[PDB]
Amino acid sequence: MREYKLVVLGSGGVGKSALTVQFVQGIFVEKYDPTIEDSYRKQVEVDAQQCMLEILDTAGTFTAMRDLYMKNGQGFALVYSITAQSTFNDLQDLREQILRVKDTDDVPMILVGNKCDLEDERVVGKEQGQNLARQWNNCAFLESSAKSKINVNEIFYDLVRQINR
Amino acid sequence: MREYKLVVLGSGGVGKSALTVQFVQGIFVEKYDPTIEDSYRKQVEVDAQQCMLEILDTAGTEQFTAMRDLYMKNGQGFALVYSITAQSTFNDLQDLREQILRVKDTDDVPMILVGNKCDLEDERVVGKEQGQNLARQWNNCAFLESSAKSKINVNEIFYDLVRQINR
Amino acid sequence: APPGVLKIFGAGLASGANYKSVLATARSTARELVAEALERYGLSCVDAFALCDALGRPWRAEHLRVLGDSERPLLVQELWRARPGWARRFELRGREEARRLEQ
Amino acid sequence: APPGVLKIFGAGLASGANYKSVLATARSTARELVAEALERYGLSSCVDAFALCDALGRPWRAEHLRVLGDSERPLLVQELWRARPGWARRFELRGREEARRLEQEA
Ligand SMILES: Nc1nc2c(ncn2[C@@H]2O[C@H](COP(=O)(O)OP(=O)(O)NP(=O)(O)O)[C@@H](O)[C@H]2O)c(=O)[nH]1
Ligand SMILES: Nc1nc2c(ncn2[C@@H]2O[C@H](COP(=O)(O)OP(=O)(O)NP(=O)(O)O)[C@@H](O)[C@H]2O)c(=O)[nH]1
Ligand SMILES: [Mg+2]
Ligand SMILES: [Mg+2]
């Protein structure tokens, strides 16, 4: 079995932990406990292949430990809350830091817009997410909800597919 | 203040701990319990200069001690100790003498030959003429007979080693 | 006295979990962290669980030591290391099974 | 595994004594060794007042220590762990109260 090391990054309260836990355990985390650093191991079939995912659930609220995430991780999910405008703005500097630390403009990645089930609460429209995805060397993009299990599997699937090239 | 590494070697029961505890703590030990490996530190003056001595009170139990190899390599001065009460202790010394001379690989090692329990004149098996001749044989070696009970030559054993190490 | 992060491993405690991390000061205790980790794996109950210093190599812990309640685990981590060759981790285990595996 | 020897340091109990060392097996407990150490230092259950300590520091006086529990097997404690780089490590025999204090504030 081939291991893929994946990293979930983004500002506090966006749903990195909820996305990870939904993917790995199949339950929805309601409580808000800010993560320090959780790690998960899940086996998936991704295109006729048995893959072993190590997924790093990182801290929103720890710049010291951040450099090690980026040096060792092969795939990165950058996650924002469609509810929270600021969370989107903070992603720009995350992209640039991954690229700075790895020294390549060609890193497997996916821009994740979380909380799409909170439709009556949008502050970041799908257009905004695509426009940045475009600017980011035409990077991959999804809107997701960890509550209703929408594109949750996609996030980590797409990442594996990308490393596979 | 120079550090002096001193090893008290010999067969069991000869009075190794006794000599050391006397020299160091000023008291004479009662009962007899097998030493694994003990270490003492005492500051004393020799010739106008105050010195630090690490004394290693070693094991009688030769079969249970392969650590012999380390402390011969490490030690700067040796006091080979036999009781004048048991002949084995004296005979089991030429072995030890050569073992030191082999490891350091020289006959010119600071050394003092020591015949302990000289207060027990009545149970003497090893003569003084025997002890002194073995010293002449051992590349004209330093020799004393000492009593840990009577304070005979106790400090003179350790001062002599220091004096021999001064080079 | 620096505040580092301790990776607390869940030796069969929350499905596909591997470790949850916990911030620890030089004044933090085992018992304070067993508390912080238990509500982190989502599991007083505190009394029946133990923070463990596990050692193995190349998994299966070859030996472990259960930490005392008073012990400061940051110092246990930062001031000691495993045998060279050997790996080391902190482990949250039920008290029963932890004491059982010390012997 | 091997029936090794452990130097138990007598950081001030009897003047002169640097260390006295005991035999320890893989099954030898801390309390067993406290009992043999006190006997060898010259000191019915005066054992419970004394502690076997895993001490550490730069090379000397100890910068941090840990009091072994009575159940703990000391040969394993020294064999399976090591000090961090540049640090010395020795077993110490101490009064339990002295030890529990230093275990908390150093
Ligand atoms: N309705 C809804 N709520 C969500 C969704 N995703 C996450 N949440 C909620 O948002 C809150 C924060 O979620 P969490 O996963 O902890 O976000 P986080 O990015 O891991 N926070 P941190 O980085 O500080 O550890 C929780 O109450 C969680 O239930 C979603 O898709 N829909
Ligand atoms: N009369 C007399 N008795 C002595 C003298 N030195 C030691 N003893 C006695 O002989 C016994 C053994 O002495 P000890 O110092 O234990 O010898 P050891 O060489 O250290 N034994 P081991 O090597 O097994 O630890 C003790 O009970 C001690 O009192 C001495 O000079 N005179
Ligand atoms: Mg989180
Ligand atoms: Mg002795």
Query: Which experimental technique did the depositors report for determining this structure?
Result: X-ray
- The enclosing domain of A49 has a CATH number of 3.40.50.300
Contact B21, B29 (CB under 8 A): yes
Crossing angle (nearest 10°) for helices A91-102 and A63-72: 60
Give CA–CA dist A57/A24, Å, rounded.
12
Kindly report the nearest CA distance between residue D90 and chain C, in angstroms. Answer: 13
- Chain B residue with CA closest to D15: the answer is B25
Q: End-to-end alpha-carbon separation of chain A, Å?
A: 17
Ramachandran category for residue B151: left, alpha or beta (phi over 0 → left; psi -120 to 50 → alpha): left
Residues in chain B within 8 Å Cβ distance of D7: 37, 39
Q: Is residue B61 less than 8 Å (CB to CB) from chain D?
A: no
With H, G, I as helix, E, B as strand and everything else as coil, classify residue A137.
coil
- Chain C residue with CA closest to A29: the answer is C42
Domains in chain D, ordered, with CATH? 1-106 (3.10.20.90)
Give CA–CA dist B58/B35, Å, rounded.
7
Question: Which residue's structure tokens are 């030959």?
Answer: B113
Give CA–CA dist C16/C13, Å, rounded.
9
Say how many C-beta atoms besides its own lie within 10 A of residue A140's C-beta.
Answer: 18
- DSSP string covering chain B: --EEEEEEEESTTSSHHHHHHHHHHS----S----S-EEEEEEEESSSSEEEEEEEE--S-STT--THHHHHHH-SEEEEEEESS-HHHHHTTHHHHHHHHHHTT-S---EEEEEE-TT-GGG--S-HHHHHHHHHHTTS-EEEE-BTTTTBSHHHHHHHHHHHH--
Which chains have 3+ CB pairs within 8 A of C?
A, D
Q: Are B25 and D15 inside 8 Å of each other by CB?
A: yes
**The two three-digit tokens of residue A7, written as one number:** 């990293």
With H, G, I as helix, E, B as strand and everything else as coil, classify residue A77.
strand
Give CA–CA dist A24/C3, Å, rounded.
30
Say how many C-beta atoms besides its own lie within 10 A of residue B112's C-beta.
Answer: 25
**The two three-digit tokens of residue A68, written as one number:** 């090690």
Question: Which residue's structure tokens are 């149970």?
Answer: B123
Closest CA to C41 of C10, C66, C4: C10
- Answer yes or no: is A61 a known binding residue: yes
Q: Are B38 and D16 inside 8 Å of each other by CB?
A: no
Chains A, C in contact, 3 or more Cβ pairs below 8 Å? yes
Closest CA to A163 of A124, A95, A113, A110: A110
**The two three-digit tokens of residue B139, written as one number:** 């590349």
**The two three-digit tokens of residue A73, written as one number:** 């991780």
Q: Are D21 and B37 inside 8 Å of each other by CB?
A: yes
Q: Which amino acid belongs to residue D84?
A: R
Contact D53, D94 (CB under 8 A): yes
Helix (H) / strand (E) element for C7: namely strand C4-10
- DSSP string covering D70-101: TT--HHHHHHHEEEPTT-EEEEEEEEHHHHHH
- Answer yes or no: is B86 a known binding residue: no
Beta bridge partners of A79: A112
Say how many C-beta atoms besides its own lie within 10 A of residue B132's C-beta.
Answer: 16
Contact B80, B113 (CB under 8 A): yes
Give CA–CA dist B76/B104, Å, rounded.
10
Q: Which of B25, B33, B54 sits opposite D14 (nearest CB)?
A: B25
Question: Number of folded domains in chain A?
Answer: 1
Say how many C-beta atoms besides its own lie within 10 A of residue D15's C-beta.
Answer: 11
Give the range of the structural domain holding residue B101, as residue numbers without chain letter: 1-167
Q: Are A36 and C18 inside 8 Å of each other by CB?
A: no
| Sheet containing C4-10: order of strands | A140-144, A109-114, A75-81, A2-9, A50-57, A38-45, C17-24, C4-10, C87-94, C49-56, C63-66
Contact A116, A150 (CB under 8 A): yes
Closest CA to B1 of B39, B53, B78, B36: B53
